[PDB]
Write an enzyme that holds these catalytic residues in place. Structure first.
Site, PDB file in Angstrom:
ATOM      1  N   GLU A  35       0.838  -1.221   0.000  1.00 61.60           N
ATOM      2  CA  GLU A  35       0.000   0.000   0.000  1.00 61.60           C
ATOM      3  C   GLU A  35       0.860   1.253   0.000  1.00 61.60           C
ATOM      4  O   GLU A  35       0.543   2.235  -0.731  1.00 61.60           O
ATOM      5  CB  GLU A  35      -0.915   0.009   1.224  1.00 61.60           C
ATOM      6  CG  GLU A  35      -2.002  -1.043   1.143  1.00 61.60           C
ATOM      7  CD  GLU A  35      -3.075  -0.809   0.094  1.00 61.60           C
ATOM      8  OE1 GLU A  35      -3.050   0.227  -0.595  1.00 61.60           O
ATOM      9  OE2 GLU A  35      -3.921  -1.704  -0.129  1.00 61.60           O
ATOM     10  N   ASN A  46      -7.814   8.764  -5.704  1.00 59.07           N
ATOM     11  CA  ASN A  46      -8.642   7.796  -6.472  1.00 59.07           C
ATOM     12  C   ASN A  46      -9.376   8.540  -7.591  1.00 59.07           C
ATOM     13  O   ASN A  46      -9.630   9.758  -7.494  1.00 59.07           O
ATOM     14  CB  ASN A  46      -9.558   7.044  -5.532  1.00 59.07           C
ATOM     15  CG  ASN A  46      -8.792   6.384  -4.410  1.00 59.07           C
ATOM     16  OD1 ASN A  46      -7.780   5.737  -4.689  1.00 59.07           O
ATOM     17  ND2 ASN A  46      -9.240   6.528  -3.181  1.00 59.07           N
ATOM     18  N   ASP A  48     -12.401   8.631  -8.295  1.00 57.66           N
ATOM     19  CA  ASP A  48     -13.729   9.092  -7.810  1.00 57.66           C
ATOM     20  C   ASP A  48     -13.564  10.357  -6.963  1.00 57.66           C
ATOM     21  O   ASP A  48     -14.623  10.882  -6.502  1.00 57.66           O
ATOM     22  CB  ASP A  48     -14.452   7.989  -7.032  1.00 57.66           C
ATOM     23  CG  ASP A  48     -13.858   7.594  -5.676  1.00 57.66           C
ATOM     24  OD1 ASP A  48     -12.804   8.126  -5.311  1.00 57.66           O
ATOM     25  OD2 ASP A  48     -14.461   6.793  -4.963  1.00 57.66           O
ATOM     26  N   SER A  50     -11.959  10.560  -4.001  1.00 58.69           N
ATOM     27  CA  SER A  50     -11.488  10.183  -2.648  1.00 58.69           C
ATOM     28  C   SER A  50      -9.949  10.094  -2.682  1.00 58.69           C
ATOM     29  O   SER A  50      -9.355  10.097  -3.744  1.00 58.69           O
ATOM     30  CB  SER A  50     -12.107   8.922  -2.154  1.00 58.69           C
ATOM     31  OG  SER A  50     -11.659   7.866  -2.970  1.00 58.69           O
ATOM     32  N   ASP A  52      -6.546   8.123  -0.545  1.00 61.31           N
ATOM     33  CA  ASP A  52      -6.043   7.106   0.397  1.00 61.31           C
ATOM     34  C   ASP A  52      -4.857   7.698   1.154  1.00 61.31           C
ATOM     35  O   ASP A  52      -3.961   8.333   0.544  1.00 61.31           O
ATOM     36  CB  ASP A  52      -5.592   5.863  -0.370  1.00 61.31           C
ATOM     37  CG  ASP A  52      -6.693   5.094  -1.054  1.00 61.31           C
ATOM     38  OD1 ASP A  52      -7.873   5.321  -0.750  1.00 61.31           O
ATOM     39  OD2 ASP A  52      -6.339   4.155  -1.786  1.00 61.31           O
ATOM     40  N   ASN A  59      -8.997   5.036   3.010  1.00 58.97           N
ATOM     41  CA  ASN A  59      -9.762   5.852   2.032  1.00 58.97           C
ATOM     42  C   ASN A  59     -10.730   6.841   2.702  1.00 58.97           C
ATOM     43  O   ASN A  59     -11.502   6.427   3.597  1.00 58.97           O
ATOM     44  CB  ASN A  59     -10.491   4.922   1.071  1.00 58.97           C
ATOM     45  CG  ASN A  59     -11.087   5.562  -0.155  1.00 58.97           C
ATOM     46  OD1 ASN A  59     -11.201   6.768  -0.254  1.00 58.97           O
ATOM     47  ND2 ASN A  59     -11.446   4.759  -1.144  1.00 58.97           N
ATOM     48  N   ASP A 101     -15.189  -4.933   9.331  1.00 63.23           N
ATOM     49  CA  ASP A 101     -16.386  -4.390   8.634  1.00 63.23           C
ATOM     50  C   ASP A 101     -17.128  -5.501   7.892  1.00 63.23           C
ATOM     51  O   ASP A 101     -18.308  -5.277   7.571  1.00 63.23           O
ATOM     52  CB  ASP A 101     -15.990  -3.284   7.663  1.00 63.23           C
ATOM     53  CG  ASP A 101     -17.142  -2.530   7.011  1.00 63.23           C
ATOM     54  OD1 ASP A 101     -17.945  -1.934   7.761  1.00 63.23           O
ATOM     55  OD2 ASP A 101     -17.206  -2.515   5.763  1.00 63.23           O
TER      56      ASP A 101
END
Ligand code: CL
Ligand code: CL
Ligand code: CL
Ligand code: CL
Ligand code: CL
Ligand code: CL
Ligand code: CL
Ligand code: NA
Length: 129
Positions: A35, A46, A48, A50, A52, A59, A101
């Site tokens: 990562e 990202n 979209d 967003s 990270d 995110n 989650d």
């Protein structure tokens, strides 16, 4: 901060990640390697809009507030900047909520694609832990 491999393994164990949700420390070290390359200051935008953040590339779409991700949540209740600290406590606490989650470490697509099913114990091999 750029951690060394065993230095990060030790910090993740100190903050209770080793075997958290059944994921051995090597899984967490492998995920951080792909990562962030162990760099706490890593950021990546990202498609979209967003972003990270940090050693585990958490995110803004769900987990932290950066003020520029419309319609996003802040489920870790932290500014995304907290995820870039030399001290990994905020990244670890948030990662614990993410891996709880329901999809485990598959939330980290780099873990799924590069760590899952591999000899992840190699990542902590030789480390005094
Ligand atoms: Cl390495
Ligand atoms: Cl391991
Ligand atoms: Cl936002
Ligand atoms: Cl929220
Ligand atoms: Cl905030
Ligand atoms: Cl730390
Ligand atoms: Cl799981
Ligand atoms: Na957010």
């Amino acid at each position: 901060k750029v951690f060394g491999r065993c230095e990060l393994a030790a910090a993740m164990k100190r903050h209770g990640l080793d075997n958290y949700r059944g994921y051995s420390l090597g899984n967490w070290v492998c995920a951080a390697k792909f990562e962030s390359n162990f760099n706490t200051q890593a950021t990546n935008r990202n498609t979209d809009g967003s972003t990270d953040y940090g050693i585990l590339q958490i995110n803004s779409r769900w987990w932290c507030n950066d003020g520029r991700t419309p319609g996003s949540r802040n489920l870790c209740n932290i500014p995304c900047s907290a995820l870039l600290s030399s001290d990994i406590t905020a990244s670890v606490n948030c990662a614990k909520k993410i891996v709880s989650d329901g999809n485990g470490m598959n939330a980290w697509v780099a873990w799924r694609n590069r760590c899952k099913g591999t000899d992840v114990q190699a990542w902590i091999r030789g480390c005094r832990l």
